[PDB]
Amino acid sequence: GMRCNEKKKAIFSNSGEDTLMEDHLQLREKLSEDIEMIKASLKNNLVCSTLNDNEILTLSNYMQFFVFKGGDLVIKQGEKGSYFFIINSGKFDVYVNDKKVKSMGKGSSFGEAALIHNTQRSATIMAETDGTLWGVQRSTFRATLKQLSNRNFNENRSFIDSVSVFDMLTEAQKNMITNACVIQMFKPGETIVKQGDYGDVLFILKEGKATVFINDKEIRVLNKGSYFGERALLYDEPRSATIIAKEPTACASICRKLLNIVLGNLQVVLFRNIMTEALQQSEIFRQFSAEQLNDLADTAIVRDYPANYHILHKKSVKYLIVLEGKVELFLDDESIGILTRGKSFGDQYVLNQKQKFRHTVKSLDVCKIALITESCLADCLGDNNIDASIDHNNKKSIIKKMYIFRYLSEQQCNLLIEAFRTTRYEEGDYIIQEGEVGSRFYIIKNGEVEVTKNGKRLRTLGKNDYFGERALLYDEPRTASIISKATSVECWFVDKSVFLQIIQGPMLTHLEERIKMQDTKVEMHELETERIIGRGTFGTVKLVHHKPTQIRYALKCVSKRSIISLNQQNNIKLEREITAENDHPFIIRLVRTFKDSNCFYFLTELVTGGELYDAIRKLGLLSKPQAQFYLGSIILAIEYLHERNIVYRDLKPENILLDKQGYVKLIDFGCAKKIQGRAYTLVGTPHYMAPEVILGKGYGCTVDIWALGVCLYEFICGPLPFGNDQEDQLEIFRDILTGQLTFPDYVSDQDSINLMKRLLCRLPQGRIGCSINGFKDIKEHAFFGNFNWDKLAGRLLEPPLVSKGETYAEDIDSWD
Amino acid sequence: GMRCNEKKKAIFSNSGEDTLMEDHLQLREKLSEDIEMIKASLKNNLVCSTLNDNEILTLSNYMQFFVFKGGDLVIKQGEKGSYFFIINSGKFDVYVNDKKVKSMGKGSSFGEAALIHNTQRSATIMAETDGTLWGVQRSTFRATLKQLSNRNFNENRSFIDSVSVFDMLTEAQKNMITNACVIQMFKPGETIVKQGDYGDVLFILKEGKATVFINDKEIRVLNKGSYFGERALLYDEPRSATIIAKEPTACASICRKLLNIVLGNLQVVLFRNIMTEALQQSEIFRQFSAEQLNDLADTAIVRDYPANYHILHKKSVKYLIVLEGKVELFLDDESIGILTRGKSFGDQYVLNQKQKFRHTVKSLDVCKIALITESCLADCLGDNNIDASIDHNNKKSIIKKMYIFRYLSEQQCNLLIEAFRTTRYEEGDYIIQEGEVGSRFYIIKNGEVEVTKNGKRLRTLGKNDYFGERALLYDEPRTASIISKATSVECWFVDKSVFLQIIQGPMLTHLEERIKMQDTKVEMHELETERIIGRGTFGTVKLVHHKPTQIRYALKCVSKRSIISLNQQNNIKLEREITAENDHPFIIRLVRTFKDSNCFYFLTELVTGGELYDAIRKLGLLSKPQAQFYLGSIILAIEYLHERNIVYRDLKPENILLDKQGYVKLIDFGCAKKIQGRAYTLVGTPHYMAPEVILGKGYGCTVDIWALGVCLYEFICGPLPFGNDQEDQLEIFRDILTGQLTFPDYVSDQDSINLMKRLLCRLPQGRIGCSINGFKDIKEHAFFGNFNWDKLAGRLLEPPLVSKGETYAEDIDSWD
Ligand SMILES: Nc1ncnc2c1ncn2[C@@H]1O[C@H](COP(=O)(O)OP(=O)(O)NP(=O)(O)O)[C@@H](O)[C@H]1O
Ligand SMILES: Nc1ncnc2c1ncn2[C@@H]1O[C@H](COP(=O)(O)OP(=O)(O)NP(=O)(O)O)[C@@H](O)[C@H]1O
Ligand SMILES: [Cl-]
Ligand SMILES: [Cl-]
Ligand SMILES: [Cl-]
Ligand SMILES: [Cl-]
Ligand SMILES: [Cl-]
Ligand SMILES: [Cl-]
Ligand code: NA
Ligand code: NA
């Protein structure tokens, strides 16, 4: 009887409030009177008041029946809060500080805070008689609101995808109008649209049927998926029919007024997408900015031609795009090809404005053409010298991709571009030699070069690649050779001397200090700690000193056990990702991280001007110029993150530091997330939290713009706008959701107010900065009318507060 | 606009499989065909086959509807398993190692292992067509089985509490027959009992109605709570009526056959409770053992008397108990009192068997009396010398409460008692003087004494208290004085010399070594570690050395992070409690614990003979004497724990060590729990786990007796009895639940087999050792027929294996 000599291990054991309710739970059929009472009760709830009948009915069916005897415990003070309760029968007594206060019966509600967030209870509800409770947990409640709003969104998106007039909207644009869909119920007999009405609404049947009439005579019936009113979004046209609902039926609907707010003029937007797609097939226009291309689209002459028409024959047309049909191109008598839908022609003439248009173009069928004239281009470029502007703008788009140049003012960036000189090299010429001290930066005009180090080759570089930019900031040996490996290579270049006549001290200091940070590979043992400069509860923030180079850093220490206990294993690596990739002047720059069996580490630049929380407190109520500066700065950082699909989620003055020059640095990305669709989790600081996070029906990047509203309000008015005196979170969220926004009598600037109201608009679609234009609407708001956004990023503005000496918050390797 | 200078902190973020299913979830009305398919599907499930129709219907309604499209993910390999699924429509394909295997449609089931326990998936189920799934999670499934069985139990207990014939059962006894209740459905017209039937079943109406007939003539109707058949449990009597159900109705029912198995003869048990309550009002019989009192109850002469009858008048009646009515006591012509129901008399005559009964007793009304004669007492005591036995047994019950004496053989304990001598002291006499070396142990016969140290007093001690027992084991100074603080105090005493002629080396060594352990207050810094002697994964087990005394210990180190990550904050303190209180020779003795910011610590005695797992492997198949010894030993440890309402829950040879003498020590109380009612959590080692833990309908201490069956099977037969080859847990639990128990042809002992079958009885009520007698049925089983339980606890048996030198498992301050 041989025995296994293996070893086999045992299974181990795993709310408290959720255990008690499980004892009282029973099944019950949901009568008419039950459904209507719950339905009435929820419409007085903080969260559920905005919900329509269909959504509340779904919630109702997820409620569970609970049965209690007299003198039985329901909820206790200081326990973790999970359930919300509607009393169905009997009486229930409320003990606060173990001393009776209230008495509740049928219709009454309690524990509404548990739905919003896991929260410590206030009272101890006790059962007097043999009474009963309808109840639901947080998890179930939040999950249910997620699925209702999420399915609503996805279904409406599919319907957007099957309406032909939206076919040429971009991904982002379709997602934005999906949110403008309003669901609209119809009973039998209700006319959905009437013949001859000048309606402006598109309808899409979700489920149901509807009869179509023309001049009171039935024509057909419409089934689930059918739609009507496309043309009503583009033009003022009477309805071609009377459509009447046969059975109970549900429509997803979009109105032109909301579309125009969210999207702008739909024709204008569609055409820009079409033109931008066409123009970007050319290597010339692919180097234009989106704004330039949109202006070409807005100003293009569009013409319909019959077949066999000579559209061009050797005005001042430089470029031609086929919108519809087909044309044939000819050089003298030789056809050179046929252009179909979306193809275009004219690169040669766009590049040489003085050149005689030699080709001819002949329609093969009835066609629609867009034409770009010379003056159309010049308006777009702001300059009659087309060839020079195009060249200038080619150089501009190369350097605006590099950290060193992309934040310089426009005037500085232009001067620098104009200072470029050109040299030609023979093959085998050493453009740069490893070990020598450089004074030049290079952009490749023509041909190819080879990057080498001590003989061994590293890579190859070609047209419009750049190299040697460090020579502009430091005097140091070149760490590689750049060898001309083609016939007659041409480079653009700029001398360090010219660069220093253009860039002014503060930006130069910022750049000098910043680019150095990657040079120095830091090891933990090379760091000594000077002092503590912060204390996050999670761990510590030590001010550290790198002995070899004497550069000073901040080291954030983050205990393993604090991460493990809260189930933040998933979240800490997502933070490291976001933190590592951030490369903006007003956002903290990570240097590297370190691993350890006891605690994680973030090594970041040291910021020496203290928190913004304390700066506004030194300044008092900020004037317009001071609020422009700080809000401006925050706007650029936030906009940078939204461009990368990152919602910050915790914007507040505490999370912004000031550097030595008085310019801001956003820190603390613990709440930040890469936004893949709609977010639902409840994260952030209550006073700064947007109502859509609280209401649990989906949010996006828009939440950070609401927070921006809160910040401007504190800056200009002083107190927070909602729940300024409140400790109790429930009451904070109540003021956020339903409180009145007011402004004190000492706020004398109508534009500041206008701006604060529109940033603090409760519905995201009404909120400035949340439409198709994004932050442009904010930046161009009259509040910023006198404010030079250009000089902000380029450190050319006198900031509100420059710290005398250093100031810290003192008295106040894969991660797995 | 002053600002709050507080700080406000942010809210943070918190299955994976549970997130996906939430997307596919929809509402659906449960039709007849749905309910019957689910109902059919569950009756083929490993867990749900034993469940009756009402229980399965409750499960059915908790199932949720899920809707999928073609090529959508349901379950993935290597993910954490939560749901069980019944396919309602369409086809579903099963990928193992990412390579297709099976095809499933309507009626088919998958993921049944997820219900039992959180487990890693085997396949990836994928949706081919637009098919649908009925599904339920583990949490919901386990919670639902908890509530059904728990409410069933509580309701049946209340009904037990309202049946008069059970009024005199103890708490424990009522709880045991509650489990014998069988629920029995009746339709309209079905006769529940028939007039003249010799039925043996008690019925209790839960909900419903039923008509009573005598001689075919209606008498009354019965309502919810009404019951009938009390007398059928006690006697063979025809039913007095025909009771027929009017409406659909549900009965809780107890049968005499099951009662007799669970409880024994109900009359006999009731009477013992009544007699034991009465007899214990006397200070004499309160010193008797439960067995002695039960024998007095079983043999008492019971008589009914008319009023005004002289029951006693100056046979050999020594004691008298009034069962019914009232009697008056008289000394000659003076009444000395009236004895009502449950009162008794005769202390004077019980203590002096030769004394002439001088009182007389006169019934005041019709009465029932129990009488205890002299020979009744003598049979109970095993001795004609009543006064001497009573005295002997008074001494016995004093010493059997002390560790030092309570495990000695009976013959040794008797000899020692017989060796007691008596001295008398004057007041102010120093019975013991602090600082002197003692040779005596003392029990106080009469009067009081005072414990003092250096003048300051500590406590007072009186009749039948004891002191100075350490003088029996060590030669050392007395740490306190014992001063006679009453007139003419009398002590019993025994000399060390006499004690050493009775107790033999092995027990003496055990006692010497054990009692020392409390003397030495250990501090962490006084410990140096010699080596590692174990590695639990949770942490380490170091062999440590106390420098001052040179005593050697085991130190178990338990990392904080291992506790925090698994949510074992609740459980580690419950373990420390249980571990600290254990004070049995065959269970590991804790010395103390220590706290630390990095890891918890258990300091325990060092055990040097290695695990039992390895010992049976050296021995091979154990003979009868060797299996008796180890199983015997385990039985005493387990019985000790059950007496303290502790279920061990992880009994297996790995959790038992052998000491230097070859006697066992149960270790590792991580799975152990103080059992407050029925337990539900799934804990332990699969191969040792009892079917009632697996089936999720409640368990108790009985689980450890099933495990004992597993152990005996490995000892005698060799392999495990269920799932001996299986790694896959699902298949282990399947063999436990429905597998056939077989025994190899080389097992030649019919009693061993009999025992193994009854320990491995699947239903707890059929399992030996789980009835009212507890372990007595096991200890008296013919398997143990030649085995001296007395010598086991007293270390008077040659054990199976004595280790040559030490052997470890080497190559193989409130806690918050
Ligand atoms: N690079 C830095 N330079 C200077 N001070 C810093 C730097 N990083 C962090 N600090 C300071 O350290 C504090 C704590 O850092 P932070 O990442 O916000 O921690 P936390 O866990 O989110 N808790 P909290 O203190 O409420 O913000 C900050 O508020 C700053 O005052
Ligand atoms: N007092 C002791 N004397 C000698 N060996 C001991 C002692 N305590 C523990 N050990 C050994 O250390 C091992 C680990 O202890 P244990 O408490 O069972 O840890 P665990 O976390 O449950 N894991 P496991 O090793 O599977 O049992 C035991 O199996 C013994 O071999
Ligand atoms: Cl897009
Ligand atoms: Cl036009
Ligand atoms: Cl150079
Ligand atoms: Cl009891
Ligand atoms: Cl009798
Ligand atoms: Cl003594
Ligand atoms: Na912060
Ligand atoms: Na163990």
GROMACS .gro file of N, CA, C and O in nm, chain B residues 378-412:
model
  140
 1194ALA      N    1  -2.409   0.235   4.611
 1194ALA     CA    2  -2.293   0.149   4.613
 1194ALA      C    3  -2.264   0.098   4.471
 1194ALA      O    4  -2.149   0.105   4.425
 1195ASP      N    5  -2.369   0.054   4.401
 1195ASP     CA    6  -2.355   0.019   4.259
 1195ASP      C    7  -2.296   0.139   4.185
 1195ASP      O    8  -2.202   0.122   4.106
 1196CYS      N    9  -2.348   0.258   4.211
 1196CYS     CA   10  -2.300   0.376   4.140
 1196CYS      C   11  -2.151   0.399   4.166
 1196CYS      O   12  -2.076   0.424   4.072
 1197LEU      N   13  -2.109   0.382   4.291
 1197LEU     CA   14  -1.969   0.408   4.332
 1197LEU      C   15  -1.873   0.290   4.312
 1197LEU      O   16  -1.751   0.307   4.314
 1198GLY      N   17  -1.929   0.170   4.296
 1198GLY     CA   18  -1.852   0.048   4.278
 1198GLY      C   19  -1.794  -0.004   4.408
 1198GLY      O   20  -1.692  -0.075   4.406
 1199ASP      N   21  -1.861   0.028   4.520
 1199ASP     CA   22  -1.804   0.007   4.652
 1199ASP      C   23  -1.907   0.015   4.766
 1199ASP      O   24  -1.980   0.115   4.780
 1200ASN      N   25  -1.912  -0.090   4.847
 1200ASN     CA   26  -1.996  -0.090   4.968
 1200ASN      C   27  -1.959   0.016   5.071
 1200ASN      O   28  -2.044   0.058   5.150
 1201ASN      N   29  -1.833   0.056   5.073
 1201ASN     CA   30  -1.788   0.162   5.161
 1201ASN      C   31  -1.816   0.299   5.102
 1201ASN      O   32  -1.729   0.360   5.040
 1202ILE      N   33  -1.939   0.344   5.126
 1202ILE     CA   34  -1.995   0.464   5.063
 1202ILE      C   35  -1.923   0.590   5.109
 1202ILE      O   36  -1.884   0.673   5.027
 1203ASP      N   37  -1.908   0.602   5.239
 1203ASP     CA   38  -1.850   0.721   5.301
 1203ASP      C   39  -1.706   0.739   5.254
 1203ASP      O   40  -1.665   0.851   5.223
 1204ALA      N   41  -1.631   0.627   5.249
 1204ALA     CA   42  -1.491   0.624   5.201
 1204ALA      C   43  -1.477   0.655   5.051
 1204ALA      O   44  -1.384   0.725   5.014
 1205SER      N   45  -1.570   0.602   4.969
 1205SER     CA   46  -1.575   0.628   4.824
 1205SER      C   47  -1.609   0.769   4.792
 1205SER      O   48  -1.551   0.827   4.700
 1206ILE      N   49  -1.705   0.823   4.866
 1206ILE     CA   50  -1.746   0.960   4.844
 1206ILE      C   51  -1.630   1.053   4.873
 1206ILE      O   52  -1.602   1.145   4.795
 1207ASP      N   53  -1.562   1.028   4.983
 1207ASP     CA   54  -1.445   1.103   5.021
 1207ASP      C   55  -1.331   1.088   4.918
 1207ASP      O   56  -1.279   1.186   4.865
 1208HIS      N   57  -1.297   0.964   4.888
 1208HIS     CA   58  -1.206   0.932   4.777
 1208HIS      C   59  -1.241   1.009   4.650
 1208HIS      O   60  -1.152   1.072   4.591
 1209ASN      N   61  -1.369   1.006   4.609
 1209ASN     CA   62  -1.411   1.075   4.487
 1209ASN      C   63  -1.413   1.229   4.497
 1209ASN      O   64  -1.400   1.296   4.396
 1210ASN      N   65  -1.430   1.283   4.618
 1210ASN     CA   66  -1.416   1.428   4.640
 1210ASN      C   67  -1.272   1.470   4.610
 1210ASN      O   68  -1.249   1.568   4.538
 1211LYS      N   69  -1.176   1.395   4.663
 1211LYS     CA   70  -1.033   1.420   4.638
 1211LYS      C   71  -1.001   1.404   4.489
 1211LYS      O   72  -0.938   1.492   4.430
 1212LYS      N   73  -1.051   1.296   4.429
 1212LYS     CA   74  -1.033   1.271   4.284
 1212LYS      C   75  -1.075   1.389   4.197
 1212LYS      O   76  -1.000   1.429   4.110
 1213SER      N   77  -1.191   1.447   4.225
 1213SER     CA   78  -1.240   1.557   4.141
 1213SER      C   79  -1.164   1.687   4.164
 1213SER      O   80  -1.170   1.778   4.083
 1214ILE      N   81  -1.091   1.698   4.273
 1214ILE     CA   82  -1.010   1.816   4.297
 1214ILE      C   83  -0.884   1.808   4.213
 1214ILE      O   84  -0.850   1.906   4.148
 1215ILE      N   85  -0.818   1.693   4.215
 1215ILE     CA   86  -0.692   1.675   4.144
 1215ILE      C   87  -0.709   1.656   3.993
 1215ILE      O   88  -0.620   1.695   3.917
 1216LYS      N   89  -0.821   1.600   3.949
 1216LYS     CA   90  -0.846   1.580   3.806
 1216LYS      C   91  -0.872   1.711   3.731
 1216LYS      O   92  -0.893   1.709   3.609
 1217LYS      N   93  -0.876   1.823   3.803
 1217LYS     CA   94  -0.886   1.954   3.741
 1217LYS      C   95  -0.749   2.017   3.716
 1217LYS      O   96  -0.740   2.117   3.645
 1218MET      N   97  -0.643   1.958   3.774
 1218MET     CA   98  -0.504   2.006   3.763
 1218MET      C   99  -0.428   1.929   3.654
 1218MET      O  100  -0.437   1.805   3.647
 1219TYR      N  101  -0.351   2.000   3.571
 1219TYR     CA  102  -0.273   1.936   3.465
 1219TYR      C  103  -0.190   1.820   3.515
 1219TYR      O  104  -0.188   1.714   3.453
 1220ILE      N  105  -0.122   1.843   3.626
 1220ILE     CA  106  -0.026   1.748   3.682
 1220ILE      C  107  -0.083   1.610   3.709
 1220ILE      O  108  -0.009   1.512   3.704
 1221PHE      N  109  -0.210   1.606   3.746
 1221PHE     CA  110  -0.273   1.481   3.789
 1221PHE      C  111  -0.374   1.427   3.690
 1221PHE      O  112  -0.394   1.305   3.684
 1222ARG      N  113  -0.438   1.514   3.613
 1222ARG     CA  114  -0.554   1.471   3.537
 1222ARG      C  115  -0.528   1.371   3.427
 1222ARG      O  116  -0.621   1.302   3.390
 1223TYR      N  117  -0.404   1.362   3.377
 1223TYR     CA  118  -0.366   1.262   3.277
 1223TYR      C  119  -0.299   1.137   3.330
 1223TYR      O  120  -0.267   1.049   3.253
 1224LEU      N  121  -0.282   1.124   3.459
 1224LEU     CA  122  -0.225   1.002   3.518
 1224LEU      C  123  -0.319   0.885   3.500
 1224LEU      O  124  -0.438   0.906   3.492
 1225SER      N  125  -0.270   0.762   3.499
 1225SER     CA  126  -0.361   0.648   3.491
 1225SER      C  127  -0.458   0.648   3.609
 1225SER      O  128  -0.438   0.719   3.706
 1226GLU      N  129  -0.563   0.567   3.602
 1226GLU     CA  130  -0.659   0.562   3.711
 1226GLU      C  131  -0.601   0.495   3.834
 1226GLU      O  132  -0.621   0.545   3.944
 1227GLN      N  133  -0.530   0.385   3.814
 1227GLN     CA  134  -0.457   0.315   3.920
 1227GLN      C  135  -0.355   0.406   3.990
 1227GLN      O  136  -0.340   0.396   4.110
 1228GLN      N  137  -0.287   0.494   3.919
 1228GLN     CA  138  -0.193   0.586   3.981
 1228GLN      C  139  -0.263   0.696   4.060
 1228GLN      O  140  -0.212   0.747   4.157
   0.00000   0.00000   0.00000
